Amino acid sequence: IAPNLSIIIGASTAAKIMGVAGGLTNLSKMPACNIMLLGAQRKTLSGFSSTSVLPHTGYIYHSDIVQSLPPD
RNA sequence: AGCUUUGCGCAGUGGCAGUAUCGUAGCCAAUGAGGUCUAUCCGAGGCGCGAUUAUUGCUAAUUGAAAACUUUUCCCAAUA
């Protein structure tokens, strides 16, 4: 169904972003800035700073290629 | 026909700032730069390197000079 998007990112992240976005058409009609925020759980900072909780983070960030980078 | 909006030059007057302005045959960037607020939201340059009195010229003092110093075979000691 989505060969190019499965080539760029793994099919697990592909499925997790396609399901949460409402389908391939809805995800394709979504701005690029709103795709990085798909599946971003509002983790509650437990005393720690907001940066430690990694705010505004979604499937893309936790994908394999992005997680293969230094944290900075 | 007057008035008026925006952009752009050309000038004139005035104010403020000098820890900053400028450069890019370097790289990257609306096919997304860059993200602490408020992020299914913000949207523009950034990075590297180089120049410098932290933009650069003239103008006028002062100093350093510069022009000169005898810029020319002395002394301790020996003998006639």
Curated annotation (Swiss-Prot):
Looking at the UniProt record, the site noted as Interaction with U4 snRNA and U4atac snRNA sits at H56
Q: How is it modified after translation?
A: Phosphorylated by PRP4K during spliceosome assembly.
Q: Where is this site: Interaction with U4 snRNA?
A: C33
Q: Where in the cell is it found?
A: Nucleus; Nucleus speckle; Nucleus, Cajal body
Which tissue types show expression of this protein? Ubiquitously expressed.
Q: How does it assemble?
A: Identified in the spliceosome B complex. Component of the U4/U6-U5 tri-snRNP complex composed of the U4, U6 and U5 snRNAs and at least PRPF3, PRPF4, PRPF6, PRPF8, PRPF31, SNRNP200, TXNL4A, SNRNP40, DDX23, CD2BP2, PPIH, SNU13, EFTUD2, SART1 and USP39. Interacts with a complex formed by SNU13 and U4 snRNA, but not with SNU13 or U4 snRNA alone. The complex formed by SNU13 and PRPF31 also binds U4atac snRNA, a characteristic component of specific, less abundant spliceosomal complexes. Interacts with PRPF6/U5 snRNP-associated 102 kDa protein.
Tell me which family the UniProt entry assigns to this protein.
Belongs to the PRP31 family.
Q: What is known of its domains?
A: Interacts with the snRNP via the Nop domain. The coiled coil domain is formed by two non-contiguous helices.
The protein's name is U4/U6 small nuclear ribonucleoprotein Prp31
Question: What stretch of the parent protein is included here?
Answer: 215 to 286 of 499
